[PDB]
Amino acid sequence: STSHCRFYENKYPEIDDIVMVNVQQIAEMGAYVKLLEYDNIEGMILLSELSRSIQKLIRVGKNDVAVVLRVDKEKGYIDLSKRRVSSEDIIKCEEKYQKSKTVHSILRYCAEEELYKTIAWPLSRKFGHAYEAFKLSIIDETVWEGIEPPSKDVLDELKNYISKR
Amino acid sequence: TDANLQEKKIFEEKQVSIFSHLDWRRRRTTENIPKDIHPAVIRLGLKLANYKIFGSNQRCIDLLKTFKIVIQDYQTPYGTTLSRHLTTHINSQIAYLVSTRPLSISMGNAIRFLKLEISVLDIDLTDDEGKELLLEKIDSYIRDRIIIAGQVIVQAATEKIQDGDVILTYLHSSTVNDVLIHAKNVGKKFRVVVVDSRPEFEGRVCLKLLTEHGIECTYVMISALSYIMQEVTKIFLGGHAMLSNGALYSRAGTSLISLLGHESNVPVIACCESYKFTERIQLDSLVYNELAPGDQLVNMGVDDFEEKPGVLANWKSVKNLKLLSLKYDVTPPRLITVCVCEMGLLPSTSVPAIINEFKQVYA
Amino acid sequence: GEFDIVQVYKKFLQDDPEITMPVAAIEALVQLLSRSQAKTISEFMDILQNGSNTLKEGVQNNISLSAGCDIFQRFVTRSLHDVGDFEQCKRHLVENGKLFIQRARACRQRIAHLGYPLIRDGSVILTHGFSRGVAAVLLAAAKRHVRFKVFVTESRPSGSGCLMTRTLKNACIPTCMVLDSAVSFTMNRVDLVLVGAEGVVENGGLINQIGTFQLAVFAKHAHKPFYAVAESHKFVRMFPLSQYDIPFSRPILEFDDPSPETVDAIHNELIMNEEQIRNNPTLDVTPPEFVSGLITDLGIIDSKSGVSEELIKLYL
Amino acid sequence: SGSGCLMTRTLKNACIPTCMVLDSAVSFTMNRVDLVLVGAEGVVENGGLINQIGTFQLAVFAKHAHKPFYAVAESHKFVRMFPLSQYDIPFSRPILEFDDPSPETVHAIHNELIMNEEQIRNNPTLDVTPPEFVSGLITDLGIIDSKSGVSEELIKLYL
């Protein structure tokens, strides 16, 4: 359906990627977390990563950035880590995030899911990103390649909606 | 200060009276203040001597938030770098502040901490590099040491609250109020007892807060403790400090609460924060303490500001007669059941180890 | 896939009855761990908890294992890391499992050759009900050829006293079973009291069988010392407030509502019925001021504040 | 004695709520009580109490749990005996003796492994509550808390 949807065409992230994740509940040995970039799917962080055996840190609803370790796509289990991220990436993710987040808030205009499959990801395939070279929608016309029609109404919202918000 | 022959005068203040040593000297006005005093420090110094209900936590916060402004407005005498000279400037701020009200434990430990980070600071930095750093360290201090610890204690505190309890507090502890209000917001079914005492009835404001959240509250002065304790089933105390022996150091009436509670078999719970622990110890509530002017109880009656005089207005000039009112007293540890630090629920006797966890595995 | 680990737990009790219930649980988890073939770290900890809780709720939510189960989890959770080979995880994991079982099995021994000198020549000891702990130390003392005598509380409703005396009588030890109502009268004779343990708390408290604190105050009042033997895997993370604040499954000590409409100096067999009994509680709690020394594989601990430092050391 | 069940019914028979408590777990109940009341089988000079075994077992709790302790005694139960400690009382049979285990080999509601009648006999049937634990002693002569007037009224009895 088109209530909540994905961000990047890879349904899962690869090993050694960097992903923003919002913490939820902490168990006796792990930290059940939801990676919001992929429709808030769940993952787990071993009780071995801090962020300066620190009992005080009981975070609930805080977005954090981590790195994937192992992935089992058939059972959905994911293992992540935190104390292994570097400098730029730890904010490059955030830098990469909100732009990607911004695009998601655009598509829920009538979806409060498929336009990624139609437009966004193939565009993200070309310029490595949607935001990156998104401004070309006013200073170039390479954005016309292989555009697929939805229906009559929301047929052309691109030239109706570029520089905004 | 004529000199420190006035400190020799203190050496003469060791006479028959048990309170001979207790320092009475204060400065509650800005008359003849020195030049090297920051304005935002003055306001605090005024807030110290004249405010009541000045929670031991807020003071540490308001001190640090003020301290940043001092350093941010500080500029070293160039040619002499920052670290070599910053302390004496700050050391000249404390010496002023103490003359308005002696340092709480919640403040002194922060002082001994910042003075440390000044020395350990890397010299290879510059001013705008250095001062910006410890500001975050100060902010980090406020984040980790108090607010979070506060946010952790309350959660662990209300955890052991049971539906149908009867809670007893005494003289407005911002932390104790902070956990009580949380208990109502999670639907805990209970009611509160509020004990107050002379002079400045600090308990009324605790009644004001709790009532403005709609809690079955009960207000009785301490000289009714024998009566009301039968209704009570649990006791919560927020302390000024906890001693390395395990004793609890809080406002003057804290002890009788714990005492009457024990002899009535109710538990005593000390919600205190780690940074208010002290390596020192006390056997009597008189060796280390601080006073309030005895005039404040001359006003008999239910008000404090209101000009209702008394029969003792001349006590200053009536020999063999003196009024006093200590503000704090210790409380032996065998009466405290649990202490609620951000390290969890601990027995009060386990305090000094926690202090070592700071001294050790850090620097 | 066993899918019925409780049986392995159960089977351990028949392959050896001389092991404590939590020991079998850990010994069963390893069998689950060793046979479990996963691919994510989360997979282990997921079924591990879902195995422990599965093991927990099966045994009336007993406390002894509930500690050991949780401690064991938080043990392997410590020095856990995943570098390169995923199989290293299980390697470091299950290898520490047996290593923990090693200490666990040797724990009940380590206290023996540590608490036996607490018995002196011709001394007289008191014990509330059977406990595997107090048994061995006495035997490991009586083995050393030392004269002493021992009373044993009958320990209603458990009645474990009738078995405790036999285990001592069989091991060449003079006994004298005593009613639960006559312990105070016995303190005059006793030189030292000693009981086992079913659970040690954050404050140094002592969750053991129903009547421990009953005689803990006596020794405290009769000025005789108090000692309790407790294995490491009996430390719990709870924290009561008195001699009462404990979660208990069945509601206890209810009353009846009598509507106005109804109907030898040793009178044996005139007691309460089984229905009357279970209304009464089962466990007890002696605050740490009444115990003078815990006996653990970690050694003898008397502060009952360092127990927390040790308890914090046990958990993460 | 097992006399609790008899006491239980006789109360329940008079429409008042009851709840039997095994002698091993009185302490756990004290925090719930507001008053403790026991009978008297005998009263000595010093204010002590001779009642069925376990009577002192309670009064120490009431003391430590800061709950009051009252005992009902009829005047004609006073006695001239004066035990020193809480133990020195004349007793018929030998009490609380041990065995002699020569080297041979003879061999949670477990409700049937109980001490036999023989080993039960080895237990005592009476304990003694020192006067420091009797907050109040009620008699036909009235209520006596002094535990010295216990003796003055006592002397007034033995002519």
Side-chain angles (χ1 to χ4, degrees), chain D residues 6-159:
Chain D
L6 202 283
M7 195 36 148
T8 320
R9 308 167 56 250
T10 37
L11 295 191
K12 154 190 306 178
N13 204 147
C15 62
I16 61 182
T18 72
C19 179
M20 305 208 58
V21 165
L22 73 177
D23 311 347
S24 147
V26 182
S27 85
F28 208 102
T29 81
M30 209 59 54
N31 69 337
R32 206 168 312 193
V33 317
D34 301 339
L35 182 277
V36 170
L37 177 53
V38 86
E41 276 278 329
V43 161
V44 317
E45 303 203 73
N46 83 335
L49 271 203
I50 322 291
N51 227 21
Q52 306 77 329
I53 179 58
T55 316
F56 173 63
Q57 223 84 350
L58 270 70
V60 47
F61 304 155
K63 186 66 170 185
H64 149 274
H66 300 62
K67 254 42 171 53
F69 194 84
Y70 282 91
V72 47
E74 316 81 318
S75 65
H76 54 90
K77 278 182 186 164
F78 286 5
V79 86
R80 182 52 191 185
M81 189 179 306
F82 195 128
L84 305 174
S85 78
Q86 41 186 148
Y87 319 107
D88 60 320
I89 51 175
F91 224 140
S92 64
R93 314 190 276 109
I95 217 66
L96 319 176
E97 276 165 326
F98 284 90
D99 305 3
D100 195 319
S102 148
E104 49 277 349
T105 300
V106 64
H107 223 277
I109 325 292
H110 321 75
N111 202 20
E112 49 277 351
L113 78 179
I114 318 297
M115 313 180 313
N116 63 45
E117 234 286 353
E118 160 182 344
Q119 59 212 156
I120 280 186
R121 288 299 166 79
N122 189 21
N123 280 227
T125 166
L126 300 184
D127 60 333
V128 47
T129 287
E132 299 78 344
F133 301 82
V134 176
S135 35
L137 185 57
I138 168 174
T139 74
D140 55 341
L141 276 64
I143 296 195
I144 296 195
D145 72 310
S146 94
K147 284 82 201 73
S148 151
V150 160
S151 289
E152 167 172 345
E153 296 289 346
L154 175 93
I155 297 180
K156 286 178 186 165
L157 296 200
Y158 282 53
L159 45 81

Side-chain angles (χ1 to χ4, degrees), chain C residues 111-120 136-138 140-142 144 146:
Chain C
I111 68 101
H113 297 342
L114 185 56
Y116 80 88
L118 263 203
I119 270 60
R120 261 313 181 263
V137 47
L138 295 201
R144 313 288 181 108
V146 47

Side-chain angles (χ1 to χ4, degrees), chain A residues 28-29 70 75 77 79, chain C residues 41-43 46 74 82 84:
Chain A
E28 322 279 8
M29 31 175 37
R70 320 293 190 179
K75 286 171 175 179
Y77 292 166
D79 295 320
Chain C
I41 315 184
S42 92
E43 196 169 1
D46 197 329
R74 274 153 180 169
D82 178 15

Side-chain angles (χ1 to χ4, degrees), chain B residues 13 18-24 286-291 326:
Chain B
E13 299 188 352
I18 323 187
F19 334 109
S20 36
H21 67 327
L22 285 201
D23 193 338
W24 49 277
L286 313 168
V287 47
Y288 290 162
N289 194 320
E290 93 166 23
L291 312 83
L326 314 180

Side-chain angles (χ1 to χ4, degrees), chain B residues 36-38 41 67 70 88-98:
Chain B
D36 50 0
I37 313 292
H38 190 292
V41 152
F67 263 141
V70 195
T88 311
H89 186 71
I90 308 204
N91 285 22
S92 296
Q93 308 316 284
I94 281 85
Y96 165 75
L97 289 197
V98 307

